[PDB]
Amino acid sequence: HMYYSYGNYEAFARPKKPENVENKSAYLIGSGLASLAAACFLIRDGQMEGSKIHILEELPKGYVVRGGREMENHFECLWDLFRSIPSLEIDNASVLDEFYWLNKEDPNYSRCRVIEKQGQRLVTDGDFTLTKTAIKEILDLCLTNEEDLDDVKITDVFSDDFFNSNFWIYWKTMFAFEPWHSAMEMRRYLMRFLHHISGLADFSALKFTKYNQYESLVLPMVEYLKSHGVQFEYDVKVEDIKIDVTTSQKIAREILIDRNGNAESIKLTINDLVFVTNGSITESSTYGDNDTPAPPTDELGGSWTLWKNLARQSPEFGNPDKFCQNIPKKSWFVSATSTTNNKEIIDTIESICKRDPLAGKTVTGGIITINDSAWQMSFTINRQQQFKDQPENEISTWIYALYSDVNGDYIKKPITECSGNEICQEWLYHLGVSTDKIEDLAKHASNTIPVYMPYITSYFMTRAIGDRPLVVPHQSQNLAFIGNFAETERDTVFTTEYSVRTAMEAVYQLLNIDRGIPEVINSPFDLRVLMDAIYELNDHQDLREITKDSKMQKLALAGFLKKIKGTYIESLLKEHKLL
Template sequence: MEAIVVKEEDKNKQVYFVGGGIASLAGAAFLVRDCDFPGIGIHIIEEMNILGGSNDGAGSEEHGYVIRGGRMLNDETYENTWDLLMSIPSLDHPGKSVREEIIAFDDANPTHSNARLVNGNGEVVDVMSMGFNMADRLAMGKLIITPEEKMGKARISDWFGPHFFTTNFWYMWATTFAFQPWHSAVELKRYMIRFMHEFPRIQTLEGVTRTPYNQYDSIILPMKKYLEDHGVDFTLKCTVTDLDFKEGDGITVTCMHVVRCGAEELIAINEEDLVIITNGSMTEGSSLGSMTSAPRLKEKGSSWKLWDRIAAKRPGFGNPSSFDDHIEESKWESFTVTFSDTVFFDLMEQFSRNRAGTGALVTFKDSSWLMSVVLAYQPHFRNQPEHIRVFWGYGLYPDKEGDFVKKKMSDCTGEEIMTELLGHLHFDEHKEAIMATANCIPCMMPFITAQFMPRAARDRPKVVPDGSTNLAFIGQFCEIPDDVVFTEEYSVRAARIAVYTLLGVNKPIAPINKYQYDVRTLFTSFVTSFR
């Protein structure tokens, strides 16, 4: 590694990232790569004993594997993510970047779903038609052209009539991005504009770019190695509980309150130091069940409490209550299933007409849980033995009674969730063989769609609040005009904005592609609405 030349003004400066998710890792990488900032002055503070935040993936053959959620990448809209990953060396292919590694893998295993929706009879639905009527089309057009400031805290159900929520489009769009009818109409509008180029192929999800393994193994581990090689400090099992601010009108952090190993500590923040916070968390409070137990529904944890606490101290820090006080509307449940044979995978590949890793979400549109599953390319974990198979699924309505298991999904064990899934697939004659090696681990996530909750314009703080000298917000709960939350790109873009702004770096940030101004995209989207 080349010797680091430290700028005079950065010799004593320290940068503290609160939270160890992809936003903080990206921010640290931008500091190293674009700001010539010494890694020894960068500190990433994480409450858990592992980095990665919501980009998780762990387990073993013996205990089963778990992915709380899967993140789908997009080759045309993740502008800053791809820029960053071009600079992160691959762990498996010397001389290649993570970006090049992902694209090579995706080119070899392109996505083209042949079974996007399945009806109650276990039949694959023809989804070439979006299923719109004229009222749906008019409402969609009005949504796209109405300024956000005129929409306020409108819900999607305020904008569209009941028919819209029975269309093929809604089932596919809602389960691809995890939208609910009561979520923010503004967020749906942003998605419709940002992914307008994907609208004509939503039935195949050809625009999805997949990583060779789960995101923790494919993205987080290479980023961690890159930062370690540059001397970045990772402080794990340490919780930031509060911030103190300099008196006066501006915003300057002077002290961080932390709890480490059960003991309270203070970290003094000098005026030249920077504090960059991931405020809020989609996966905080997650709870795992097992084949014989259901997960528990938990409440707020440290990330939300920290945001609540500092938002009460200063204006301009947003309104966390819009996001963290609506668990009944922001929760859903996922499940990860581990098999020690290929029986289920063989049946699913035959049923879906997709080899594992080339399909997409298979959604059971008549499922009372609105359940979806997806089979990734195997192995999906670095330590996964050759004979092991792992897939992931989720239900958007965990409080509804199942169609085959007469219990709420949230009350079901892993065995009962598998029974419900096999019922929808009509795999009855193979049930005994499938269940013989199945290890289904359910995961309840109380805040997983909190970022979609209806909100006012200022409920999310700016990345760098007005008047701030050393504080920034990153992650899914800061405000980036025109961009879409629940994406890797949102976190990476926020981190880049935060770092460049606080350090006064005059370098370009990859702009958001404006597909709504492309005539061809507009025309193909219009035609698609009449399919």
């Protein structure tokens, strides 16, 4: 009911109005990115009436920032969407226009990626330091079929050399991978972003919106949806969806909801579509303050309860317990936003990242990782300020720790027992600030808000094929699953692109929209990209240097070079620095 494409013909073409869409409706369970994106596609490409689009939201109608909102040029579906969303900052421009010009005048890249020993730059910062053994494990994982990686951990496919490389430092912190996480997803990430392998260590491929995601992405979409008459319904808690799973069809029949404290039922026909964002990484989040830890919690909220209630109606609707249960207590739980106008802290950051944090341009250019921190802590300062109404002499630093059950190096407690100022203290210690100044700087010169998120690592938990429902399950007539717990080929979860892709594929499949959906970018199949990957993974070495200490490889290269000597193949390899 859909097909994949690439290139400008399908990118620029508009689909015909889908058949019978005038008699159809749509219900979106949640107000997250994927739901908003699906509503936008329903308006723009489905041409469905806005009065027939119902966004069900459970909520009624210091600074806290969120990390992991990096973008790249090849977010193919996301840019298809946001070229149609008007900017709220520039007249007669799209969100993509604003994003595109901004990252041209202020291109992102890091001048200091890893620090250690209380503020010193890692001496090999920039290099991957992968042994030939570690490189082979990388390629061996990529050559493994995804079907053979059910429930396989990252530690099952990599050994000591890899986990000691600089590559693993960059990789695990920029993507928030834990050693026990899905090797299947690790493999997807390896192939998905291969075209940016030369920009991995210095973050030169990253692109950021001007403000936080809510200001720069959500609010423009909401304004677009509101200007098209989309129904935003609040105080709606979806408890279950009655689905008929027969030998021939899957049909959602009823949405069982609590609407403002009253038990209600939404009757559905085959023409009423339901889009379920199954699972949530932010559900059950708790907050502390400068003097209070964010209270740890294991509670299952509405999103996880609903997926469980859908999963007991068919195994084709996924297995939520693989993602929300048995999360190791070492996993990342706590993040913190530290806000300050203190010049000593701001100057300390400038001395490390080499940029004025208050200038309004790129600062750290992405996370700085403290390699020898017991918490495995990283921090980033985006373009300041990240909030429109924040004072111009303030910065807000985002901090997160990959290990939650280890005592800190300065605050000798696990991060889950730490207040905002205590997290700030441990961070300032690793910045190199004097231990006689750190306590007062955190307590009285800064405000740090910690957040405890039980499911923040849930996207990456070890999974088997079938644990995630297909975007449109087999024989589903009016039910779709979207978001980063839905299943689609090749693309990587924990990205905003995945939310937009699944939203797009859901709308196109359910309405049978006659336009191609852009395939995940073809970089793993591009010889030019694979050539660059070989060059970068070996830390800028020729094919001669790569094979110099291997008999079988040096022999095979010799016969290869003799065949390609006069040819376009050699010119290509030379152009990509492999010869």
